[PDB]
């Protein structure tokens, strides 16, 4: 009934979805070949899979996913890996040349011959879908396919579908850690062209998950696999209300109407809490107040910025597991009595609370531990303006003497779009300070 | 007890006939030795329609095999499912067709027509309720074109009441394989249009396009191209052989599909088609099948129906499905692309449902289409014909094997008149 | 433009690998349920071509119940008179059928038709058992001249096939060289058609020798009874066999200028030599 | 060489009726059942494909699940008995032309009737 | 005693008669082997089967039906199924080739070789009778084996017999969906000549039964078997008064004199209630008033023709079950006080009420629930003139440029019959207009 279409754009999005669909397969109990092995005769119906899996003919459940990338070897790793006979081969759309960390190359030349094919696949999935809820778009703001083609996808999806929700599970560049050099260019050119074609842009910082996985999950050497598994846990916690039944619930529209106060302000930071290994978990007594304070802890945010230099507008508050509503209410009362957590004066009531009874399934061979309670925080703080201003400063530093602009110009992009993106991000940050004050 | 005598003349006709007999032998449970090794008793009740009872449990197909060479006929006798044919109906010559309609129609092919007609007469009076004859020919060679069309003329003269099916591999704008395809096509369609009850014009270019786009299939060769034609020929006549809630035989299809007598050129199709990587991800259902039927890329003729206008459509659904779903699907498509249908005919779709689906598929469907857009094919053949005939190119073979240029002129004028009829029945409004 | 191996991930490799996977799945299905032609042919070679111990005579005469092998000598003029056709080599009468009754049921089942294989080796397809026909004849008794017997195969793999002939009627004749047919049957329709006798070499001592015991390793004549025709190799043309190309044994009383049996009418009974029961016994 | 010719011939022969046109399975045995057989000839279910008569409600399709038109009868194929009748005729044909039959019409037709026939 | 003969002609007739005789065997407790199950006892008092079944000696009940089909396709299933030892072998009359949707082929060439045999079988089944009431003729207007051979059969039957009633159950084409293309030709040429030799012709429409099954039975995708079962329930509700005792019974002689005002307007519409399923019948209250209002609802008519665009002329009330005539009269009064249901000024009276005591039967593996009461409209109104107008519009659209006429002409049918058929349908439209005004 309620289904979501997941579009994974770029190498980062494809790898995040590679962790994700493994987690969804484990959660809904389907084998990597697409079969349900339960067959419990008297029971075993379990219609909860009809949110991210589509029932085909011979008992095979295919995901509602489009793994799109302009460059091979990563979707080829998907096609040759253990999740081979799970995805539709026509949902693994690939090009021939990457954008090569160039927003102009991913938005103006290489993305044109493949946007029609990915739109046709999206239309086919929507036609099979009965009661579509929204799109979950996993990409990175760093550059290349995940910038230009993602922005192009938002443009055509807002042209075609319109009112449907479009969530952006974006990967955001760190204050200090940066792989690409033209990451400020690609990030701001993504922000300018997806600022009006999105509904909730959850950015996620790699440095913050690095700190979380080192401090909490006591791992000395984390790779991208742990980061993508934690983001899979984020998206599973968000969509658990749609998938499983339970207590007071939210859908995507319930979710976005409480987290987007102003039309330009749709940028909620994500936070997950259980983040505990087995050794630290068995010497712990995880309860609703403890894990709510764990979410409100400034060292648990998935974007590297302290929320003390900012004011919370709204918080969507997803509890999951052995959760009692009055324990939730007492916890939220305690944080509202805490003076250090600062809410904005025009939002006296700011907690979109939702409880589910299905605790998360930890991936075997992973890093987390099995728990009975879980919190997901999605908070629209006025602290992400510091991140926007620091990338604005980086863009001004690069664009002061026109470094790396000749690639865009000779590829087919004007400097007027650079200036327009600069002015739009300045408008966005002054809008944030005007609403926050 | 309606009876079909299958005939095939030429190399291509013999190949597609051998594939047809394979695809119907594993439908009816006939082993390569000819006996009946099936166990479902629904198969062994209309087996007489294409087979003939022999001693033991053996069933010999009712096929007349014609070729003017001891080549590919020996090849299809030595191939798989080639031990089922009687050796009497392997009349073949010891000459060459020459890719020559004159050589096939007025010389050494013509003195084989006595033996061919004796075999056809024996196989036709061995029946009791003969529905008709089904010739699969090449239309661009010398044995399929000339000998096939003269056999059509003689059989139509002898039995001017039975149903004449002709599966013709009409030449393409692309490809080649013969320089005198326009001559062998015009001089054969001139007799087809006056001697055939219904003609299915299959095109090798469209078959290659299907192999490209719905089956990927880097190296399909002629085997897959003949297999699609065999599947279509099996799906057209399935209501004669298996029960169903809404039957339709060849005479029902002809009556419901042919408005005017010289308007019997169709574009067949078959649409439970998907690639090998998507065979276990595609769900067999009536809307999906109907969408692939009415998709313009699944035509087995090179003509694109979007530039023309459908006059009549026939749809035969093998398998167990729901009649409301089928009827409302055709209502939906006829409401949607209503500009692709003639206004002076309401309800341009004839529906048939057969209970038994083919091998592997739980649900299959075949498509027959009479449209204006087939006139582009005859216009192309006319343009090539008037390009060669204006300069007498390759004409001395035809006129020295024994003919006249008046036959060439008559064929060109008749096929241009057929083009004019198809064009006039396109944009003429009702009131 | 350029094409690569499907192991190289450049072109149509995904559904090429899918098609190869489906073909491999079908191949493993036939391998596990045993309809592969390789396995059928290997089972045929293992079960048919197995050495069979012959019977060693004591007094040199053929006795009832002996296994023995029907052989024919090569042509006396082995010198190549004309280049082309090879002169007829030494060969052994054997049992034949085409493909399907070999492939399934593993045994010689029904009507077979015979042939002459060049393999001078005792084997299941080419050893027999001399058996009585009139009943009341004790086993181990001499076969003699002018005395009817039946040529049957072993009761193991083969199912006790009995030699049989017919006429030159237009429903059953040799596949080449239209003549009397030599078959191996299991049901035995009529007992007289499944019956054979042995005539001596010289056609003057024949009437006096009727009753005398038959010697083993010299040339004798296999005469039917019902049609009074003698066995012949009939060289110059061959019948198809799964084990090669073999001559076509035909019942035909062939006569030379002095109305006597030709080179292909003199078959020999080969026992086991008294050193080990396999192999041949050498002529005398 | 005498190998590339045979390889090209078998390549041009072309695939199979199971490598092409076959979806999900490659069996014709389970689909040889008719609507009349599964509706008017009863043809009760067996095994896992036993549809309940409850016909409860679904939310994922907004319709009642157990469609009898979508879940037809699977199992033994449709049989009338004329296969067995024709098999008896074929055994009679094989029992004919057996050389030593030599049986006359009088001998076939005028035999010793049973005691209960009197 | 109240004997009747059913002739099922055509493919649709054969399928409908298959369902009808299944329902009759279940109603009278007759096994598919044609024998009573030997535990009836009674003593011959329950003779309420002789209207449909004979009694051939030891107890074999041979139905009074003639199954006619020019093709050997759908009658061979009857000959080989479990109903093989129920029908007389030459009551299942079979042709050699079908008439190929061709009126001329079914009326002149293939019609005039089996018509002598079918009249011989009807003569045998009619003189093996002791008070025959009439002929129930089940056919479709599709053409040839259906409408054509039924036309020839009734042309011979009117000459052969006399005042015996010949009721027709005709599958009328839908406004939108139909199988054949020459359907308007067959319908016009059949309603030209069966309009003079019939007595009362019920119209049943496949699109209407599809909408009934979708809305009330909740089956989204019914096959023809469900339609045949519903038609069998209609015919059983018609003929239940000839079998089972009731408060007041109606006969076929009573029937035409109540629903045919003038001989050219003998075209009624059938409607049934309740057609609700077993999952909603036990929760919805099912009594006389609301089942009568359900019948008189425009979205229940089994013809696909709204009676709101016409005037009711006569109606046949058929109740069966635990129905009291006081509630019958109360329901009729509530119908007559409604302004939407408009009668005609020359018929101030008219509701032919029949009440039968036998409750409706249920078929195993069927669609309808076990209800204790049911009601059938058999109504004659001016609404069907719209269907005639649509049919004549289709006929003129096809005949304006002589489409498909050459088959009829070369089959041995003169061309003026089309024109005279169009005159007859124009006269039928004008007669309906002057009756309605
Ligand atoms: N969380 C997470 N981030 C990743 C992962 N892989 C790459 N990234 C992010 O991606 C950024 C680099 O740009 P990409 O997303 O790889 O570029 P692209 O979208 O694939 O487009 P191209 O330039 O054509 O390669 C880095 O800054 C990383 O933060 C991953 O596995 N997990
Ligand atoms: N309600 C219902 N209608 C049917 C059924 N079978 C066929 N029809 C209708 O009959 C029309 C065509 O006539 P058919 O019954 O198919 O064939 P026919 O009446 O025997 O005439 P021929 O085609 O010459 O054989 C179609 O438009 C169908 O709507 C059925 O089982 N139930
Ligand atoms: N589909 C298909 N087409 C064929 C086959 N063989 C030949 N053709 C086509 O037939 C045309 C030539 O006809 P041909 O067979 O030579 O006629 P013939 O010489 O009289 O037998 C060529 O254009 C081929 O494309 C075949 O096996 N399958
Ligand atoms: Mg990349
Ligand atoms: Mg019919």
Hey, are the CB atoms on C23 and D19 less than 8 Å from each other?
A: yes
Do B129 and E97 form a contact (C-beta atoms < 8 A)? yes
Residue C279 Cα, gap to closest chain A Cα (Å)? 59
Q: H or E stretch including E406? A: helix E405-410
Residue D110's alpha-carbon distances to D93, D104, D105, D106, in angstroms, are 22, 10, 8, 6
Q: Tell me the β-bridge partners of B59.
A: B53
Q: H or E stretch including A167? A: strand A165-172
Token readout for B308 is 């023309």
Q: Is there a catalytic annotation at residue A183?
A: no
Q: Which three-class secondary structure string do you get for chain B?
A: CCEEEEEEECHHHHHHHHHHHHHHHCCCCECCCCCECCCCCCCCCCHHHCEEECCCCCEEECEEEEECCCCHHHHHHHCCCCCCCCCCCCCECCCCCCCCHHHHHHCCCCCCHHHHHHHHHHHHHCCCCEEEEEEEECCCCCHHHHHHHHHHHHHHHHCCCCEEEEEEECCCCCCCCCCCHHHHHHHHHHHHHHHCCEEEEECHHHHHHHHHHCCCCCCCHHHHHHHHHHHHHHHHCHHHHCCCCECCCHHHHHHHHCCCCCCCEEEEEECCCCCHHHCCCCCCCHHHHHHHHHCHHHCCCCCCHHHCCEEEEEEEEEECCCHHHHHHHHHHHHHHCHHHECCCCCCCEEEEEECCCCCCCCEEEEEEEEEHHHHHHHHHHHHHHHHHHCCCCCHHHHHHCCCCHHHHHHHHHHHHHHHHHHHHHHHCCCC
**Residue (of E216, E327, E222) closest to E271 by Cα position:** E216
What number of helices (H) and strands (E) belong to chain C?
4, 14
Residue D11 Cα, gap to closest chain C Cα (Å)? 14
- Name the residue facing E77 among B2, B128, B243 (closest C-beta): B243
Q: How was this structure determined?
A: cryo-EM
Distance E87 CA to ligand 5 centre (A): 20
CB atoms within 10 A of CB D100: 10
Q: From the candidates A155, A207, A254, A417, which is the catalytic residue?
A: A254
Token readout for C117 is 């294989």
Q: From the candidates E55, E155, E254, E290, which is the catalytic residue?
A: E254
Hey, are the CB atoms on A1 and D59 less than 8 Å from each other?
A: yes
Cα gap C261→C199, rounded to integer Å: 11
Which residues touch A14 (CB under 8 Å, ≥6 apart)? A8, A67, A69, A74, A75, A78
Eight-class DSSP state of D32: -
Cα gap A327→B223, rounded to integer Å: 71
CB atoms within 10 A of CB E22: 21
Distance C109 CA to ligand 2 centre (A): 54
Cα gap A12→A186, rounded to integer Å: 15
Coarse DSSP helix, strand, coil percentages of chain A, rounded to the nearest 5 percent: 45, 15, 40
**Residue (of A301, A316, A302, A312) closest to A257 by Cα position:** A316
Burial category of A199 from C-beta neighbours within 10 Å (exposed 0-12, middle 13-18, buried 19 and up): buried
Ligand 1 in reach of A205 Cβ (< 6 A):
no
Distance C169 CA to ligand 2 centre (A): 57
Q: Which chain D residue is nearest to residue A42, measuring alpha carbons?
A: D48
Distance of CA B67 to the CA centre of its chain: 18
Pocket of ligand 2 (CB under 6 A): B 246, 252; E 10-12, 15, 71, 98-101, 140, 142-146, 171, 178-180, 206, 224, 227-228
Resolution at which this structure was determined, Å? 3.3
Q: Which residue has the tokens 């062998």?
A: B184
Q: What ranges in D65-104 are assigned the alpha helix state H?
A: 82-95
On whether any CB of chain D is under 8 Å from the CB of A38, the answer is no
Hey, are the CB atoms on D98 and C189 less than 8 Å from each other?
A: yes
Please name which ligand lies nearest the alpha carbon of A11.
1
Do E37 and E31 form a contact (C-beta atoms < 8 A)? yes
Q: Tell me the β-bridge partners of E248.
A: E355
If you take atom 12 of ligand 1, which residue's CA is the nearest one?
Answer: A142
Token readout for B28 is 């009816």
- End-to-end Cα separation, chain A, in angstroms: 42
- Name the residue facing A58 among D24, D58, D61 (closest C-beta): D24
Eight-class DSSP state of C192: G
Distance B143 CA to ligand 3 centre (A): 10
Do E192 and E421 form a contact (C-beta atoms < 8 A)? yes
Cα gap B360→D30, rounded to integer Å: 10
Ligand 1 in reach of A198 Cβ (< 6 A):
no
Cα gap B134→B165, rounded to integer Å: 5
If you take atom 26 of ligand 3, which residue's CA is the nearest one?
Answer: B12
Crossing angle of the two packed helices E384-399 and E416-436, in degrees rounded to 10: 150
Ligand 1 in reach of A12 Cβ (< 6 A):
yes
DSSP codes joined into one string, C92-151: EEEE---SHHHHSSSS--S---EEEES--S--TTT--EEE-SSS-PPTT-B--SS--BEE
Which residues touch A337 (CB under 8 Å, ≥6 apart)? none
- Name the residue facing D63 among E77, E220, E225 (closest C-beta): E220
Which is the closest atom of ligand 1 to the Cα of A209?
A: 1
Residue A90 Cα, gap to closest chain C Cα (Å)? 11
Pairing label, strands A61-63, A65-68? unpaired
CA dihedral (D12, B4, B26, B116) positive or negative: negative
């Amino acid at each position: 009934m309620r289904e979501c279409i997941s579009i994974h754009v770029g190498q980062a999005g494809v790898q995040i979805g590679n962790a994700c669909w493994e987690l969804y397969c484990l959660e809904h109990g389907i084998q990597p070949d697409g079969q349900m092995p339960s067959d419990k005769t008297i029971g075993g119906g379990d219609d909860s899979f009809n949110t991210f899996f589509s029932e085909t003919g011979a008992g095979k459940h295919v995901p509602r996913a489009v793994f799109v990338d302009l460059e091979p070897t990563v979707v080829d790793e998907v096609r040759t890996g253990t999740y081979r006979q799970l995805f539709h081969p026509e949902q693994l759309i690939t090009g021939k040349e990457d954008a090569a960390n160039n927003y102009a190359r991913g938005h103006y030349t290489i993305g044109k011959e493949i946007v029609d094919l990915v739109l046709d696949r999206i239309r086919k999935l929507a036609d099979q879908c009965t009661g579509l809820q929204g799109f979950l778009i996993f990409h990175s703001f760093g550059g290349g396919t995940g910038s230009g083609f993602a922005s192009l996808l938002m443009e055509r999806l807002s042209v075609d579908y319109g009112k449907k929700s479009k969530l952006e599970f974006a990967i955001y560049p760190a204050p200090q850690i940066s792989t690409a050099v033209v990451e400020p260019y690609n990030t701001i050119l993504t922000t300018h062209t997806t600022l009006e074609h999105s509904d909730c842009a959850f950015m996620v910082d790699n440095e913050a998950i690095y700190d979380i996985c080192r401090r909490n999950l006591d791992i000395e050497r984390p790779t991208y696999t742990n980061l993508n598994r934690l983001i899979a846990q984020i998206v599973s916690s968000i969509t658990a209300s749609l998938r499983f039944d339970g207590a007071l619930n939210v859908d995507l529209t319930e979710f976005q109407t409480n987290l987007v106060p102003y039309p330009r302000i749709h940028f909620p930071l994500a936070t997950y809490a259980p983040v505990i290994s087995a050794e630290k978990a068995y010497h712990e007594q995880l309860s609703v107040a403890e894990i709510t304070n764990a979410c409100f802890e400034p060292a648990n945010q998935m974007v590297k910025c302290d929320p003390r230099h900012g004011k919370y507008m709204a918080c969507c508050m997803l509890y999951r597991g052995d959760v009692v509503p009055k324990d939730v209410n007492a916890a939220i009362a305690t944080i509202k009595t805490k003076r250090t957590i600062q809410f904005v004066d025009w939002c006296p009531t700011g907690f979109k609370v939702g409880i589910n009874y299905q605790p998360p399934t930890v991936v075997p061979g992973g890093d987390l531990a099995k728990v009975q309670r879980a919190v997901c925080m999605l908070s629209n703080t006025t602290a992400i303006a510091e991140a926007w201003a620091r990338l604005d400063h980086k863009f001004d530093l690069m664009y002061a003497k026109r470094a790396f602009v000749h690639w865009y110009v000779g590829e087919g992009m004007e400097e007027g779009e650079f200036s327009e993106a600069r002015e739009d991000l300045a408008a966005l940050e002054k809008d944030y300070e005007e609403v926050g004050v | 007890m309606r009876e079909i005598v299958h005939m095939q003349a030429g190399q291509c006709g013999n190949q597609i006939g051998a594939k047809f007999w394979e695809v119907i032998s594993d439908e009816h449970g006939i082993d390569p030795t000819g006996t009946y090794h099936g166990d479902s008793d629904l198969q062994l009740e209309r087996i007489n329609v294409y087979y003939n009872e022999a001693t033991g449990g053996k069933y010999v197909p009712r096929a007349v095999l014609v070729d003017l060479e001891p080549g590919t006929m020996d090849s299809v006798r030595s191939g798989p499912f080639g031990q089922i044919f009687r050796p009497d109906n392997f009349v073949f010559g010891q000459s060459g067709a020459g890719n020559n309609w004159a050589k096939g129609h007025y010389t050494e092919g013509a003195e084989l027509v006595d033996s061919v007609l004796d075999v056809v007469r024996k196989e036709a009076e061995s029946c009791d309720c003969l529905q008709g004859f089904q010739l699969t020919h090449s239309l661009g060679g010398g044995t399929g074109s000339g000998m096939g069309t003269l056999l059509i003329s003689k059989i139509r003269e002898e039995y001017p009441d039975r149903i004449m099916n002709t599966f013709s591999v009409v030449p393409s704008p692309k490809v080649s394989d013969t320089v005198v395809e326009p001559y062998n096509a015009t001089l054969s369609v001139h007799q087809l249009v006056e001697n055939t009850d219904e003609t299915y014009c299959i095109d090798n270019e469209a078959l290659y396009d299907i192999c490209f786009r719905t089956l990927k299939l880097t190296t399909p060769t002629y085997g897959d191209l003949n297999h699609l034609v065999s599947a279509t020929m099996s799906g057209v006549t399935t209501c004669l052989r298996f029960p169903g809630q809404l039957n339709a035989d060849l005479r029902k299809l002809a009556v419901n599909m042919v408005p005017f007598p010289r308007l019997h050129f169709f574009m067949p199709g078959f649409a439970p088609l998907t690639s090998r990587g998507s065979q276990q991800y595609r769900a067999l259902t009536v809307p999906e099948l109907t969408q692939q039927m009415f998709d313009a890329k699944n035509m087995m003729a090179a003509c694109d129906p979007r530039h023309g206008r459908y006059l009549t459509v026939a749809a035969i659904f093998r398998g167990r499905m729901s009649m409301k779903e089928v009827d409302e699907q055709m209502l939906n498509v006829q409401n949607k692309n209503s500009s692709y249908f003639v206004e002076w005919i309401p309800n341009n779709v004839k529906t048939a449902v057969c209970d038994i689906p083919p091998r592997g598929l739980k649900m299959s469907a075949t498509f027959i289409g009479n449209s204006t857009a087939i006139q582009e094919l005859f216009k192309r053949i006319s343009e090539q014909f008037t390009a060669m005939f204006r300069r007498k190119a390759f004409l001395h073979w035809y006129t020295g094997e024994g003919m006249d240029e008046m036959e060439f002129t008559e064929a060109e004028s008749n096929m241009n008149d057929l083009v004019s009829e198809y064009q006039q029945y396109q944009d003429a409004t009702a009131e | 433009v350029r094409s690569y191996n499907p192991s190289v991930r450049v072109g149509n490799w995904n559904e090429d690998t899918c098609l190869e996977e489906d073909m491999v799945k079908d191949f493993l299905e036939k391998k596990e349920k045993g309809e592969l032609l390789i396995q059928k042919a290997s089972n045929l070679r293992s079960t048919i071509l197995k050495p069979s111990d012959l019977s060693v005579t004591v007094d040199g005469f053929v006795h009832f119940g002996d296994t023995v092998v029907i052989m024919n000598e090569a042509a006396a003029d082995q010198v190549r008179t004309q280049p082309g056709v090879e002169p007829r080599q030494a060969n052994v009468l054997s049992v034949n059928m085409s493909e399907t009754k070999m492939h399934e049921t593993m045994r010689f089942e029904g009507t077979c038709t015979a042939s002459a294989s060049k393999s001078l080796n005792p084997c299941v397809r080419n050893t027999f058992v001399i058996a009585p026909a009139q009943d009341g004849i004790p086993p181990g008794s001499p076969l003699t001249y002018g005395q009817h017997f039946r040529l049957c195969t072993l009761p193991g793999v083969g199912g006790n096939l009995v030699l049989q002939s017919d006429r030159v009627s237009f429903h059953a004749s040799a596949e080449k060289s239209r003549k009397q047919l030599i078959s191996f049957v299991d049901e035995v329709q009529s007992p007289y058609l499944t019956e054979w006798r042995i005539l001596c070499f010289n056609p003057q001592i024949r009437m006096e020798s009727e009753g005398l015991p038959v010697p083993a390793n010299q040339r004798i004549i296999f005469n039917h009874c019902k049609s009074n025709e003698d066995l012949c190799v009939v060289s110059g043309m061959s019948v198809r066999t799964p084990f090669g190309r073999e001559y076509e044994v035909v019942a035909h009383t062939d006569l030379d200028s002095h109305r006597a049996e030709k080179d292909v009418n003199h078959w020999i009974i080969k026992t086991g030599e008294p050193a080990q029961p396999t192999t041949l016994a050498k002529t005398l | 060489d005498v190998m590339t010719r045979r390889a090209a011939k078998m390549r041009n022969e072309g695939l199979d009726q199971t490598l092409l046109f076959a979806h999900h399975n490659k069996n014709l045995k389970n689909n040889l059942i008719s609507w009349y057989d599964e509706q008017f000839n009863k043809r009760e279910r067996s095994g896992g494909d036993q549809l309940p008569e409850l016909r409860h409600w679904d939310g994922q399709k907004l319709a009642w699940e157990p469609e009898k038109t979508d879940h037809p009868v699977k199992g033994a194929p449709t049989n009338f008995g004329l296969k067995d009748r024709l098999q008896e005729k074929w055994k009679t044909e094989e029992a004919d032309k057996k050389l030593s039959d030599y049986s006359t019409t009088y001998g076939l037709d005028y035999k010793n009737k049973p005691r209960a026939a009197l």
